[PDB]
Ligand binder design. Structure first.
Ligand code: HEM
Ligand code: HEM
Ligand SMILES: Cn1c(=O)c2c(ncn2C)n(C)c1=O
Ligand SMILES: Cn1c(=O)c2c(ncn2C)n(C)c1=O
Ligand SMILES: Cn1c(=O)c2c(ncn2C)n(C)c1=O
Ligand SMILES: Cn1c(=O)c2c(ncn2C)n(C)c1=O
Ligand SMILES: Cn1c(=O)c2c(ncn2C)n(C)c1=O
Ligand SMILES: Cn1c(=O)c2c(ncn2C)n(C)c1=O
Ligand SMILES: Cn1c(=O)c2c(ncn2C)n(C)c1=O
Ligand SMILES: Cn1c(=O)c2c(ncn2C)n(C)c1=O
Ligand SMILES: Cn1c(=O)c2c(ncn2C)n(C)c1=O
Ligand SMILES: Cn1c(=O)c2c(ncn2C)n(C)c1=O
Ligand SMILES: Cn1c(=O)c2c(ncn2C)n(C)c1=O
Ligand SMILES: Cn1c(=O)c2c(ncn2C)n(C)c1=O
Lengths: 468, 468
């Protein structure tokens, strides 16, 4: 069982000594972030470890990161770490490899332009108003408020309407078929027993694929495949009600070099957009409101900036959202402290030599975002929430390969601008109406989960008083 | 279990209807050759079938075959069908894929030039003399002679001396450690229960690789890895006795673009050369002596040609072997009737469109050599042994993509000239001394095995009388 455990020694690369069969997974007992921080302060700029038999090489040099993420992306570092069983979701752009990905990224790029986003802003803002009416019902009743519930329902409303044109107040329709299914698309905890078992027994993945066992649950995928079918037909009939959702943008793409999106590929992308945006958006928004509640000074200044740009609670628009600097600064600093990706990864497909370091075929090159976002070498007082880092005066010292909450290069986050616009639109409408103060039962300082997802240990609960 | 069984229907390609899970493997009850002949006369120029879930596309068009074997070899049809578990023998040139193969083929090409073969001919001829002394011991005693025994011992003697410099009369040293180990390298019967099981459960191959279970038996591979080690050291010490074996040619290659052969790669090639030459050479030589014994006219003419070129039983040399035309004609016609490969195969690595036919990614493109060698469209009276086909007058009508006993293109047989020279050298020395006549217990007509290897059903036994 000590087959490949000798790689990093032959190359002279340091790291924690692995155990037979297990590799270094027992060190994940405090999550990915704490393991990366510990390895960083312990072994320096580069180190190696083993997820079972799989070797992983961590890199922290911003010149080296640029070579992996940008310069040699097509040639060597094109794909992410394999995982499964994935079934047909192999066709999702985030999972596809080599030429299949390059084609899918080429097909989906016009869907995420600033023009299509501009046409989605009125839809997103509608549920910012819905978010305020539900927040006010929990504010006129003096009761502590679980953020991820009210931000989860907001993210759900934005997803259903901007990806399928389905318009629901999901907080008050918890058993609409579209809401209960979409709510089941929970992010993967790679440290739970099932995924840790697969990590230790990767040879069992082909056995699960032949039995049609899938990490994306069949019941939800079957419901969306048929729902897309019914919408693709009905949209052909009533063809006067113009739509501006991802489904409609992808339906149109099939009406043109590359092959057009197949009907199954189209479903795969629609599903992966939900996974990408649903718990991510609500998690970040909760992190933001925590930092705003623990720093009343920052919250007031943002509320003053919003009222200067949008007097009299004027509705946020596309151009006015991008106008607010302190809002962008608050969002960025919160993502520095809580980069929910935790890591960026690329599989080394060829025996390569970059920046003087030899990297052999099969190694997973990893960029530890959570650690680099808190590295004293680039951030003074990294544990403190200080949005002034991202002011126009100081944003020249921020290295774009140390700060990668959306990745970088050709395979970065394709929904970055959408996610930023979505979160800011929510933040503006919420702060125009409310202020957020800690409870007695608020966890200060916030503690992170020991699991495989960057989320609070306990839910963030805050008191919400109206600005009336 | 009927997952991929719908491919050839969507493409409109005919073939036998597959069963769930099994595919079409139950049709292998008469071997590969009879299944290919039956499918050819039944479905035409192109057909498809399933080895379990694996789709296989058979092609018979010589223009299409050239595109697969030659024109699009590097781009699309580079590798052979995956099989396992293979362990470290993944590094053998016949098993390696993509850039690994292209490098290994580049490293091994100078080893198989006509110059290195010219320097090996004296060694090979030595055991042609040994073959005659052992044949005569079985001829002065009137007793029927099993060909594959006396040709197996000859092929063994040629292999040990031309690949390792180990010089043994293996027929009379059956328990030299080098002889009993090398004799265990038996060709793979892909129709025996184990390989048929792997075909039906290909998802179990990763489970066997993690347990170091290997189709190349460990005991023999361990013996040769250490034997090569001891020879690589001892050859460095006594460095005046010049050697002309494959091991010495590959030892020298490590003393130079590409990376040099590693010590493990070098062992992998040495092993695969034995698999390639051991039972193949003795099988063909047996087939040749059968056709010569069933056609006394052809045998006398060849004996007269040999005596005209080499009067007084003169020893065959490099230039005199290539001089004999009827010898080349006899060898070729026997390989037409018995192309021990049976099939050539290439995996389709990309969605391609060649000669008007669309071929999708993952399909195994197969060229049925045994069937094309007996196709009435190109061979008049194909079931009859008629060496005049390969005379200089008639060799203009022979299509090099219908007649492929050594394959074709960049990935053809690299030891073709060696194998032809080895077999002819044996044939000359044998026919200079003996004549071969059928027994009562000789199977006339010869019947083929129902297994996965092109070999006689019963051993070819012939009477051997001396030409004294
Ligand atoms: C706060 C919200 C989000 C964050 C922090 C985030 C972050 C990230 C990160 C770090 C990556 C990997 C980048 C890399 O490997 O270099 C990624 C990939 C991706 N994201 Fe986002 N994301 C968010 C929301 C979204 C949304 C709303 C979408 C909507 C479509 C989306 C679509 C994608 C896709 C498709 C990929 C894979 C791109 C590819 O493989 O080519 N993400 N995201
Ligand atoms: C009567 C004897 C032999 C016959 C009929 C024969 C036939 C063949 C055939 C049909 C192929 C596949 C060609 C293709 O896929 O297009 C092949 C491949 C090969 N043969 Fe031979 N062979 C013989 C003996 C030998 C010998 C003595 C060697 C000694 C080294 C050898 C070395 C190889 C190798 C290395 C390959 C794989 C080439 C590659 O994958 O690049 N063979 N042979
Ligand atoms: C720890 N880990 C990951 O973090 C991971 C993964 N596949 C994708 N990711 C992100 N696998 C298999 C894994 O073991
Ligand atoms: C955390 N995580 C992953 O790490 C992941 C994923 N899909 C693929 N991967 C690798 N999803 C949906 C996810 O939530
Ligand atoms: C616990 N668990 C999972 O977490 C899981 C799964 N299939 C996919 N996932 C993610 N199965 C079968 C499972 O038992
Ligand atoms: C948590 N979980 C899953 O997430 C899961 C599953 N089977 C499939 N999936 C996706 N099982 C049994 C499960 O317990
Ligand atoms: C880190 N990460 C990814 O790696 C990712 C993604 N969507 C697709 N991928 C691959 N999202 C939302 C994400 O946060
Ligand atoms: C939240 N999230 C995702 O949603 C995700 C992912 N990889 C793929 N996806 C979709 N990773 C690493 C992730 O953290
Ligand atoms: C029938 N068959 C072959 O003929 C074969 C093979 N791998 C190589 N060959 C030649 N496999 C897996 C196979 O099933
Ligand atoms: C018949 N046969 C094969 O079909 C084969 C092989 N090695 C690999 N393959 C595919 N050997 C040694 C073999 O004898
Ligand atoms: C019958 N048989 C084989 O034929 C075989 C094998 N491993 C490799 N081969 C070829 N095992 C384990 C086996 O039982
Ligand atoms: C015939 N055979 C093999 O050829 C073999 C094996 N184990 C490994 N090999 C290669 N066993 C058990 C076996 O019966
Ligand atoms: C058909 N065939 C092959 O396919 C082959 C081989 N040696 C290597 N390969 C791949 N030999 C001797 C062979 O006869
Ligand atoms: C005899 N033989 C081999 O020796 C061989 C092979 N494929 C690889 N090898 C080595 N095939 C198909 C084969 O028939």
């Amino acid at each position: 069982g000590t087959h490949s455990h000798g790689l990093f020694k032959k190359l002279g690369i340091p790291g924690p000594t692995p155990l037979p069969f297990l590799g270094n997974i027992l060190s994940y007992h405090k999550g990915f972030c704490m393991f990366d921080m510990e390895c960083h302060k312990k072994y320096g700029k580069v180190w190696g470890f083993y997820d079972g038999q799989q070797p992983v090489l961590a890199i922290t040099d911003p010149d080296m990161i640029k070579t992996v993420l940008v310069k040699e992306c097509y040639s060597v570092f094109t794909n992410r770490r394999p995982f499964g069983p994935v079934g047909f979701m192999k066709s999702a752009i985030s999972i596809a490899e080599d030429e299949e990905w390059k084609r899918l990224r080429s097909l989906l790029s016009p869907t995420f332009t600033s023009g299509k986003l501009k046409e989605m802003v009125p839809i997103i803002a509608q549920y910012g108003d819905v978010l305020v009416r539900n927040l006010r019902r929990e504010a006129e009743t003096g009761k502590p408020v679980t953020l991820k519930d009210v931000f989860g329902a907001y993210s759900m409303d934005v997803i259903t309407s901007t990806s399928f044109g389905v318009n629901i107040d999901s907080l008050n329709n918890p058993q609409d078929p579209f809401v209960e299914n979409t709510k089941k698309l929970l992010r993967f905890d790679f440290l739970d027993p099932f995924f840790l078992s697969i990590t230790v027994f990767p040879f069992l993945i082909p056995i699960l694929e032949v039995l049609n066992i899938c990490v994306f649950p069949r019941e939800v995928t079957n419901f969306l495949r048929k729902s897309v079918k019914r919408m693709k037909e009905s949209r052909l009939e009533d063809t006067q009600k113009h739509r501006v959702d991802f489904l409609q943008l992808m339906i149109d793409s099939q009406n043109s070099s590359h092959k057009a999106l197949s009907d199954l590929e189209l479903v795969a992308q629609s599903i992966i957009f939900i996974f990408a945006g649903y718990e991510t958006t609500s998690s970040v928004l909760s992190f933001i409101m925590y930092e705003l509640a623990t720093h009343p000074d920052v919250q007031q200044k943002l509320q003053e900036e919003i009222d200067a740009v949008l007097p009299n609670k004027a509705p946020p628009t596309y151009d006015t959202v991008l106008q607010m600097e302190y809002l962008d600064m608050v969002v960025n600093e919160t993502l520095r402290l809580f980069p929910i990706a935790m890591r960026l990864e690329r599989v080394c497909k060829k025996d390569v030599e970059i920046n003087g370091m030899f990297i052999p075929k099969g190694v997973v090159v990893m960029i530890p975002s959570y650690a680099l976002h808190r590295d004293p070498k680039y951030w003074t007082e990294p544990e403190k929430f200080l949005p002034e880092r991202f002011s126009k005066k100081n944003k020249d010292n921020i290295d774009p390969y140390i700060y990668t909450p959306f990745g970088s290069g050709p395979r970065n986050c394709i929904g970055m601008r959408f996610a930023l616009m979505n979160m800011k639109l929510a933040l503006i409408r919420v702060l125009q109406n409310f202020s957020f103060k800690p409870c007695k039962e608020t966890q200060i300082p916030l503690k992170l989960s020991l699991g495989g997802l960057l989320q609070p240990e306990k839910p963030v609960v805050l008191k919400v008083e109206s600005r009336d």
